[PDB]
């Protein structure tokens, strides 16, 4: 006679959990996550912004990297998110407890974050994490300003309903660098067609491809660096092979179209 199964932990490739030292992207912007998950620290004269934290167990590593950059816990002011899955929003609750930081997010991302990623449209309760509350709700095209650095939200619903690209202009060599942190455009194991939980999924992905294509985008980064052809472990040439936003959108749409054809066959 047979017991119910044990809960299964959300396990991931080792590289997703492999710590790295801070890697500078531009004058104020640093990758402080792991080798295969993005967590961006933007340092300003008036405190720091974090865009994503990666997995739940990355909190202490992120704070260690912030310390290495001269950002104490009290200096972290704002947390922004690409999307509220466990592999990007994992440590957010813990970061809020351990720091000054408040969270800004759209309504979709706020509702998913508040349930710790449970009742996911596609994953059910398989990929959960500690719940957190948003301190501010943002609308599409709304800007947030920290220490003179302006962050713009561009909604790109698909991967999750609240999926967001964040854009801001940093500098390098006395010139502006328009950074686009564009969310995932994957649909891993999703039912795309006729999904009762997401009836207009396909139309949203199509609009999201177009949004990503048109972003101000001297430099693209993505929550999974591989999606944009970054190699964070390659030091001075980490970003050399990086995709444009145009190429990223196009590659995603081709994969998505292939997925639709396979789903129809399957
Ligand atoms: C001090 C130093 N660098 C900055 C500011 C203040 C404000 C805005 C800004 C925008 C892009 C790059 N650097 C800065
Ligand atoms: Cu500056
Ligand atoms: Cu995700
Ligand atoms: Cu992810």
DSSP 3-state of 237: helix
Going by their DSSP bridges, the two strands 219-221 and 175-181 should be labelled as parallel
Return d(Cα 179, Cα 195) in angstroms, integer.
Answer: 34
Return d(Cα 71, Cα 37) in angstroms, integer.
Answer: 20
Side-chain half-sphere CA neighbours of 37 within 13 A: 31
Instruction: Tell me the CA–centroid distance for residue 38 and ligand 1, in Å.
Output: 22
Return d(Cα 153, Cα 104) in angstroms, integer.
Answer: 10
Instruction: Tell me the CA–centroid distance for residue 175 and ligand 2, in Å.
Output: 10
Return d(Cα 244, Cα 153) in angstroms, integer.
Answer: 19
Sheet containing strand 164-172, strands side by side:
143-146, 149-155, 164-172, 175-181, 219-221
CB 205 within 8 A of CB 256: yes
Return d(Cα 259, Cα 191) in angstroms, integer.
Answer: 10
Return d(Cα 88, Cα 95) in angstroms, integer.
Answer: 13
45 lines ligand 1 (CB under 6 A): yes
Q: Count other Cβ atoms within 10 Å, centred on residue 49.
A: 25
46 is in an annotated binding site: no
Question: Could you give the angle at the alpha carbon of 226 between the alpha carbons of 188 and 176, nearest 5°?
Answer: 125
28 lines ligand 1 (CB under 6 A): yes
88: left (phi over 0), alpha (psi -120 to 50) or beta: alpha
250 lines ligand 1 (CB under 6 A): no
Side-chain half-sphere CA neighbours of 60 within 13 A: 1
Return d(Cα 147, Cα 45) in angstroms, integer.
Answer: 5
3-state helix, strand, coil in the chain (%, to 5): 30, 25, 45
266 lines ligand 1 (CB under 6 A): no
1-266: CATH superfamily: Ribonuclease Z/Hydroxyacylglutathione hydrolase-like (3.60.15.10)
What b/e sequence results for 167-183 when a residue is b if at least 16 CB atoms lie within 10 Å of its CB, and e otherwise?
Answer: bbebeeeeeebebbbbb
C-alpha closest to that of 248 among 228, 232, 230, 219 = 228
117: left (phi over 0), alpha (psi -120 to 50) or beta: left
What b/e sequence results for 27-38 when a residue is b if at least 16 CB atoms lie within 10 Å of its CB, and e otherwise?
Answer: ebbbbbbbbbbb
**Residue with the nearest Cα to atom 11 of ligand 1?**
170
CB 169 within 8 A of CB 151: no
Where would I find the H helices in 2-152? 59-68, 86-89, 92-98, 107-114
Catalytic annotation, residues = 83, 85, 87-88, 159, 190, 224
Tokens 């950059």 belong to 69
CB 149 within 8 A of CB 44: yes
DSSP 3-state of 252: helix
Return d(Cα 250, Cα 258) in angstroms, integer.
Answer: 12
Residue 116 DSSP symbol: T
Instruction: Tell me the CA–centroid distance for residue 124 and ligand 2, in Å.
Output: 43
Kindly state the greatest CA–CA separation across the chain: 71
Tokens 């809020």 belong to 96
CB 148 within 8 A of CB 115: no
Where are the domains positioned within the chain? 1-266
Return d(Cα 170, Cα 216) in angstroms, integer.
Answer: 12
Structure tokens at 233: 């472990």
Q: Count other Cβ atoms within 10 Å, centred on residue 251.
A: 15
């Amino acid at each position: 006679e047979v017991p119910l199964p044990q809960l299964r932990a959300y396990t991931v490739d080792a590289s997703w959990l492999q710590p790295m030292a801070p890697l500078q992207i531009a004058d104020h912007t640093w990758q402080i996550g792991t080798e295969d998950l993005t967590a961006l620290l933007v340092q300003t004269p008036d405190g720091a912004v974090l865009l994503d934290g990666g997995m739940p167990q990355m909190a202490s590593h992120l704070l260690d990297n912030m310390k290495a950059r001269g950002v104490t816990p009290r200096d972290l002011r704002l947390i922004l998110l690409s999307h509220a899955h466990a592999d990007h929003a994992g440590p957010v609750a813990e970061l809020k407890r351990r720091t000054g930081a408040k969270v800004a997010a759209n309504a979709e991302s706020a509702v998913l974050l508040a349930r710790g990623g449970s009742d996911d449209l596609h994953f059910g309760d398989g990929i959960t994490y500690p719940p957190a509350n948003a301190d501010r709700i943002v609308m599409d095209g709304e800007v947030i300003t920290v220490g003179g650095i302006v962050f713009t939200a561009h909604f790109m619903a698909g991967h999750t309903p609240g999926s967001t690209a964040w854009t801001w202009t940093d500098t390098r060599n006395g010139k502006p660098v328009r950074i686009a942190y564009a969310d995932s455009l994957s649909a891993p194991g999703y039912q795309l067609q006729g999904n009762p939980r997401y009836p207009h999924l396909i139309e949203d992905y199509r609009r999201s491809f177009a949004t990503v294509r048109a972003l101000p985008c001297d430099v693209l980064l993505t929550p999974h660096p591989g999606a944009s052809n970054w190699d964070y472990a390659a030091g001075a040439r980490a970003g050399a092979k990086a995709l444009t936003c145009k190429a990223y959108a196009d590659a995603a749409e081709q994969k998505f179209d292939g997925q639709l054809a396979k789903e129809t066959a399957g």
